[PDB]
Amino acid sequence: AYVINEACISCGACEPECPVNAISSGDDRYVIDADTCIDCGACAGVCPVDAPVQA
Ligand code: SF4
Ligand code: SF4
């Protein structure tokens, strides 16, 4: 699992790019479903603030 850090600016860009649809807008920011994420890094790759990190 990657996890989206609080640097997230809630731009939405990563949501459509996750190959497994593991991202949603959460209550405070975007959030990753750790039961689906496969660590591809694509979300970080489209993130202007580099908020998703491998955890
Ligand atoms: S690392 Fe890959 S699988 Fe995990 S949330 Fe980001 S885009 Fe989706
Ligand atoms: S691309 Fe980055 S800043 Fe935009 S919603 Fe996703 S994690 Fe947040």
Swiss-Prot record:
Binds 2 [4Fe-4S] clusters. Its cofactor is [4Fe-4S] cluster. SUPFAM superfamilies: 4Fe-4S ferredoxins. The keyword Disulfide bond does not apply. One of its GO terms (molecular function) is metal ion binding. One of its GO terms (cellular component) is cytoplasm. Ferredoxins are iron-sulfur proteins that transfer electrons in a wide variety of metabolic reactions. This is 4Fe-4S ferredoxin FdxA. It comes from Gottschalkia acidurici (strain ATCC 7906 / DSM 604 / BCRC 14475 / CIP 104303 / KCTC 5404 / NCIMB 10678 / 9a) (Clostridium acidurici).
